[PDB]
Design a protein around this ligand. Sequence first.
Ligand code: CTP
Ligand code: CTP
Ligand code: ZN
Ligand code: ZN
Lengths: 310, 310, 310, 310, 153, 153
Amino acid sequence: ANPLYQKHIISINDLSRDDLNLVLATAAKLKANPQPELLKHKVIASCFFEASTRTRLSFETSMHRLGASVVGFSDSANTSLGKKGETLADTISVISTYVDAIVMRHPQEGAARLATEFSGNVPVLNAGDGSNQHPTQTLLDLFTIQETQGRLDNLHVAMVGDLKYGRTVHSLTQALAKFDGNRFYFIAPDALAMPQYILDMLDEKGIAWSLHSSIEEVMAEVDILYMTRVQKERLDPSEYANVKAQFVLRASDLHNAKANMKVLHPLPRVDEIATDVDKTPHAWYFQQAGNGIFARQALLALVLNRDLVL
Amino acid sequence: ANPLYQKHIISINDLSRDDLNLVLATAAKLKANPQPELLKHKVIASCFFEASTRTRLSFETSMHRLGASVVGFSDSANTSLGKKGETLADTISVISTYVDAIVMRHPQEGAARLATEFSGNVPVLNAGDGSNQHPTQTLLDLFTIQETQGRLDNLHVAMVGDLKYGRTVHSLTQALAKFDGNRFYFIAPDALAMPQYILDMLDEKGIAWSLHSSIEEVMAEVDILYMTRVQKERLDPSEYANVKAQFVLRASDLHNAKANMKVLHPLPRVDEIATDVDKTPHAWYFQQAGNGIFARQALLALVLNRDLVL
Amino acid sequence: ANPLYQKHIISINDLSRDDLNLVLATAAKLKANPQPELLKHKVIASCFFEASTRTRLSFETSMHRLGASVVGFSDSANTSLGKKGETLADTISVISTYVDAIVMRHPQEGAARLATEFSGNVPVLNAGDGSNQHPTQTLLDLFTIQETQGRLDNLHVAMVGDLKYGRTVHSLTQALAKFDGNRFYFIAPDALAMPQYILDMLDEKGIAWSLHSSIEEVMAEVDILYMTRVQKERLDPSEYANVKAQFVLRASDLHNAKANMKVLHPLPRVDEIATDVDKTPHAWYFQQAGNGIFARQALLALVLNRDLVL
Amino acid sequence: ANPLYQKHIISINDLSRDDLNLVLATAAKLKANPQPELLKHKVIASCFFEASTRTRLSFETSMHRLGASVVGFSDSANTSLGKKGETLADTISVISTYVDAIVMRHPQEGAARLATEFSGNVPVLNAGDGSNQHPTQTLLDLFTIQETQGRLDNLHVAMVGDLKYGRTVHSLTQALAKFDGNRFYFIAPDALAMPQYILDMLDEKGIAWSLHSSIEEVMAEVDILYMTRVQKERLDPSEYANVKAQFVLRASDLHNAKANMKVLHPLPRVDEIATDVDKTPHAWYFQQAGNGIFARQALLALVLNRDLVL
Amino acid sequence: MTHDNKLQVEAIKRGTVIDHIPAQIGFKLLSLFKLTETDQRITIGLNLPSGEMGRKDLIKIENTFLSEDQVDQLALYAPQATVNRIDNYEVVGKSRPSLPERIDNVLVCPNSNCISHAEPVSSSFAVRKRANDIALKCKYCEKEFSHNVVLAN
Amino acid sequence: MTHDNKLQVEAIKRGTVIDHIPAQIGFKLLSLFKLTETDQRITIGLNLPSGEMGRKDLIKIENTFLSEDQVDQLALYAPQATVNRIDNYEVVGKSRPSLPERIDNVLVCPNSNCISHAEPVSSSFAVRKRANDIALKCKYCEKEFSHNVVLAN
Ligand SMILES: Nc1ccn([C@@H]2O[C@H](COP(=O)(O)OP(=O)(O)OP(=O)(O)O)[C@@H](O)[C@H]2O)c(=O)n1
Ligand SMILES: Nc1ccn([C@@H]2O[C@H](COP(=O)(O)OP(=O)(O)OP(=O)(O)O)[C@@H](O)[C@H]2O)c(=O)n1
Ligand SMILES: [Zn+2]
Ligand SMILES: [Zn+2]
C-alpha cells in the first residue's frame, strides 16, 4: 500500500517531503502514459459549496480522465443544502454513504477537516477551505516548478503582489521550505505584506529571504516569479491606483531574465501581468493550469489505489 | 419480461404487494453482487424542476453505479425551462425524444403523472411531486425496515412528528397497510395529526392503530420508530416551542427499547433527534439513506431490463 | 393632564375600559370638529421596519390632519437601520433625540416594549409587533362598533376565519371583554381555532361564547360579523379548498341578517368577502378603514397634548 | 449677508476657522431659542443616492424643525435617478429648477462638487461622497466638543480605530487643526493607521501628535476619546480577532479618565464600545447624535437666510 | 470557629447559609445568581447526607445577607431550602423561598421571535399560580409558557 | 486548630484536593471541567485565606482521582495549583500541573469563520510555549492565536 492510500489531503502541513515527491513523480508518469480506466467504477462527489469554476472543471476533467463518474453540485447560488438547519456533519454523513471520495470546497476554514470526522473511510480531498488551505493548488504549482526548473531545492523564487491575503503564496512558501537552499524575495505593497508567522517559520529553519520594492531589483537572479492578484478592495480605489498598482509585469521588464525564469499566477489575472508577457517564453501561467490535471489525477490515483501500476 | 418492465413509477398506490416484494428482492441482490454495466449505453435525464440535493445525488449515483449516463438540470434557481410559456407537456415531449428514462421532481402535485401522457415509451419515475407522492423514498424506507427487521408484516411501527403534512409518513402507512398485522402508534402535536383519510383507510382494512402523547408510553413494544421533522412555520415560534417541541428523541429515551428497534428519519433532521442518539445501535437514519442507492438502482434495473440476470 | 398624556401605547392589555372610552370619545369629536393645527411644530417619526403601506398611510395622514411633521422610512428589503450590528435599542436611543413621538411597526414581538426603555420621555406607539399587538386596529374596530351599534356592551359579535393567528381577533376579544354582557360566536376551521387562552379568560369573566361551523348558523342573531383573512400558507392547497361549501360571505347569505348588522374586516379581503357584499347595507370595511384616521388622530392628540378642549 | 449665505457646503477644507465658529455659534442659539418658521415656504430636496437612514432622518428633522418642506428619495437597490444613462449632471440640472436647496449623499467622490456646476444658484450641501467628505458630521462633532469641553483649542483628543479609512476621523483632524494648541493621540492597529497626508499636514502646522497602541496608555491625559468603527471586511476574521486584548472600550478602562473626558462615536457601535460605558458620565455618543439636529439647522439657516437675528 | 466536620460542616460568623438545596441545584444557583463574584469566604458542600432528603447541597456565604426578594428568586430551583441568617454564631433568622411575582435575568424566553434575544435588556417574566404548576409571561412578547418549558431553554 | 485554617473542615479519607487555586479560577474550574457532575461529596472554599499565598480557592472531591491528563488541563487556568491524591487520611501524591500537548474541549476558536462555531465538534488547540506566551493553534481553521486572545474569547 502506497503511503497516501486512503488519506485525507486536507493541508499542506500534513504532507511530508516524501509525500510531496511521490505525488510529483506519479503526476509525471500519468502525464507520460495515461491510465484512463484506473478509477473505473469509482464515483466521486464534487461538492463545491462555494463556487469555483476553474477549480471544479479541472478536478472533474481529472476524474474523467481516469475513468471515474462524478456526481455533485456547485452552490453559492442555491442548491438546497443546509436547508432547514442541516449541519455539514450530517450532509457528509449522508454523502459518504455512497460515493468513494469527496472533493470539496467550502467558505469556512476547517470545513474539509470537519468532513473527515464524519466520512468513515471515504477519503476527503480539500479544494479550498476559506482563507486556510488549498493543497491541490500547491501540488500543481510545485509540479510546474519542478517540471520547468528540474528541481525543487536551491531555487530563487520571487513572490510578488498581495502576500498578506493570498492563501496560495502562504502555502507555497511552506511547501518550498520543506526543501533545501531556496531563497525568497517578497515584493508587496506595505499594506499587503507577508505575515510574520511565515517569516518567523522561515527564520527558524535558516532560510534566506529579503523584501524588495520593484521586480527590477531582482529579475536577474530569479528562477520562478510567482505573481498574485491584488484584490482591488483590500485597498481603496485611490490606494490601489496611487502608486501601489506598480506590481505589474510587462514584457519589457523581462529583458534581463534568466533563460529559465518562468512567470506563474494561480489566475484570474486581470491587471498585473500585461498581455504582451504571454508571447514571451517565460509566460507559464496557462501551462501551469494544465498541469493541474496531472497533479490532481495523481492524488486521486494514489488515494484510491492500494498499489500503483507503472 | 418482469412486471415492472417499462412501467412508470408514479405512485405507491399503483404498486402491489408483489410489486413491492420484487423491488425489494432485487435491491438485496444488487447490494450483494454489483452489476455496474447493466445500464451501459442508457442515458437517463435527471430533471429536478424543484431542487432537492439529497435526492438528486442519490438517484444519479445509483444511475452511475449501473453504468448509465446522466444529463439533466436542478432548477428552482433558474435553468431556462418554461421560458416563454413552454408548457410541461412540451418539455417532456422534447426530452423523451432522446433519453431512455426521465427521473423528475416537480413542485406541483400530478406533474409526474402528466409527464407520462407525453413521454411515449420512455418510462417516467417520480422523485417527488409537491405534497403528493415520493415512491422512491417509500421503497428505501421499506427496504430498511425489511433488512433490519427481517419482515414487513407483524410490525409495531410508531410515527412521531408532523404527521399532517409529512408526505412520506402518509405513503409509508399506505405501503405498510398492504402487508399483515402491522400495528400503528401515532404521536403528533394536535395541530399536526394524521389525517382522517389515512385513518379511515386503516379502519376499513381492519388495521390497528392508536394515538399516544409521548414516546415513553410505547417505546417498549416498538420495532420501527419513524421520526419526521416538524417544520417550524407550520406552527408559530411560540407554538413550536410551547410544549409541542417535545417530540424530540434523545439517547436516554431509548433505555427500554427492544434490541431490534431502529430509529428512521427521511432527513434533514435538525432538532428532533438529539446527536447522542447517533452513537446508539438503534440510530439507523444514515444507513437508511445509503439503502436509497439500492432501492433506487433496483427500480432502474427492473424498468429498463426485460429480464434480469441473477 | 389627560390620563394618556405622554404615555406609551403598546398593548391593549394595558388600557383600562375607561382609557378605551376616552380615546373613542375624543375620536368622535375630532371627526366632528377637526383641529388641523393641534400638533403644529411637532415632528413624528414613522419607523416602519416592516412594510404595511395601508397602516403607514393611515397614520401619516393622521399626523398631517393635525398639522404635524413627518420623518421616517419603511423597509421591504432595504434601508440601513437596526442594520444587523446596529441594535434596535441604539436606533431608538438615537431617534428619540430627534423627534417628539415614534409610531413603529416591527416584525419581532415586544419590539415596541423594548423601545419604551430607550426612548427617554418620547412616547412610542405600537403599529404592530410580530404576532403580539396592534392596539390602533382594535381602537378603530371598537370606534366602528360603537358608531354603528350605539354601544360597546351587550353585543352579539361573530368572529370568523383564522382565529388562531389573526392578531386583530385576539385583541378585539380582550377589549370587548372589558365592557359587559357581550356574547361571542367563533366560526373557524378547527385547525385555526381560538387559542385556549382567549377562551380561558372569557370564562373567568363569566362571558358567553360558543363555537359554530358556518356563519349561516348565527346570521340571525348577530350584530357585528368580523371576518378575518384565511392565511393560505399554513394550510395545504387542498385543505384550504376543502372546507364545507366554505366560510366566505356572499350577499345571499346576508338575506337574514339584522338591519343593523355590519360586516367588518381589517382588510385585505382577497377571497372571503365577495364583491356583491359591497353594495349591501351591511358592508362596512371601507368605512371602518376611514375611521382609522379618527382613532389615530385621537391617540396622538391625547398622548402629545396635555388636555383636549374640543 | 452672513458669510455663508447661498454658499455650497462641500468640504471641510473650504470652511475657514471663522466659518466653523459661525456655524457653531448659530447652532448654540437655535438650540436655545428655536425658530420653527424660519424656512417657511422653502422646499428642500433630500436626494440620498446612497441610503443612510440615520443621516437622512437627522437632516429631514432639521428641515422640519425650521418649518421647511421636504421632497427627495433614498436608494438601496431601487428608484430611477441618475439611472445609468441619465447623468448626475442632468438629474441635478432638473432638480435645481424645482427646489430651493439640495442636501445629497452619493457613493462616488466629488459627486457633490459636480452638482455645484449644475445647480444654478441652488446651494448643495454634501451629506457624504464616497470616501471624501462629510462636513455636517465634523460640524456636529466640533459642536459636541465645544459644548462639553468649553473650547476648541488646547485639547488632548484621542482618535481610535480605523484611522486609515474613517472619513470622519480624517475631517475632524483637519478642522481641529485650524484652532490652536491641540495635541493628538492616534491609537490604531498599524494596518489601519493615519495616512501620511494627515500627519504631514499636522507637522507643517507645528501640531503635536503621537501614536499609541492602546487607549489604556492615554486615558489619563485625555479630553475627547473619539472611537471609530473597525471595519471588518478589509480585515481577516483572525486578524480582526487577534489585536492584543483589543481596542474596545469598557467602563473598567475608564476608571482613570478625567471627569470632563467624553467618549464620542459617529455610530453605529456594534462592538468597540460596551453597554456598560453607556451608564458612565463619559458617554456622549447619543447626545452627540441629538446635536446633529442643531448643527444642521444652523447650516440651513445661514445658507438660506441672509442674516440671522436670533 | 466551631467544630465543623463535613457531613454537615459548622459555623461561619455572620452571614447566610442556604441549606436544604436539592441535589445538583447548588451549583446551578451558584452560577445563575452570580453568588461567587464576591470577596467573602464562601464554603459550599455538595451531595451531603441529611435530614430526610437523604442527599442535599449547601452554600455558606459570610458577611453577605441576601434577602427577602433574593431569597424569593430561589423558589423555582430550591423551593424547600431554608436561608438562615447568622450573626455572632447564632441563627438569628430562618426563612424559606416564597414564589416571587417577577423573575428577572435568569430565564430565556422560549419564543424564537421574541426581541429579548437580540438585545441589551435582561429577561423578565411575570409569574402565576402556586405549586399545581406555574406559568411565566415574557415582559416583552407577552407570550405565556409553562415554567417547565422555559426551564429547558 | 489555631491560627484557624481548619477548625473541623474536611480532612478526607480518599480523594483529590486542589489547593492554591489562585482566587476566581475556582469557580471556572468547576464549570469548565464539569467537576460537580458527580454524586460524591465535594467541598469547596472560595476566597480562602492565604497569608500562605495571598488568597486562594480549594476544591476537595472525594473518592475520585482526577489525574495525569486531567491535571495538565488545569495549567492554563490555575498554573500553580498543586493537586494532592489521598487514599487513607493524608497526601499520597502531590502533583503540579505541567502544560499539556493539546487542550481539548474547553476553549473557543476566536476565528468567527472557523467551522467549529456552527457544528457538533469539540474544540481542540495545539499548545506552544513561545516564551513570552503560549500560542494556541486551532485544529480546524489552523489559525494560531496568543492564549490571551483565546481566553478572553
Ligand atoms: N454560626 C453558624 C450556625 C449555624 N450554621 C448553619 O445553620 C444551619 C441551620 O441552622 P440551625 O437552626 O442552627 O440547625 P437546624 O435546626 O438543623 O436548622 P433547620 O432544621 O431549618 O435545617 C446549619 O446547617 C448550620 O450549618 C452555621 O453555619 N454557622
Ligand atoms: N486526610 C486529609 C489530608 C489532607 N488533606 C488536604 O490535603 C492538602 C495537602 O496539603 P499538605 O501536603 O497536607 O500540607 P500543605 O503544606 O498545606 O501543602 P502545600 O505545599 O500545597 O501548602 C491540605 O490542603 C489538606 O487540606 C485533606 O483534606 N484530608
Ligand atoms: Zn419573549
Ligand atoms: Zn478555529
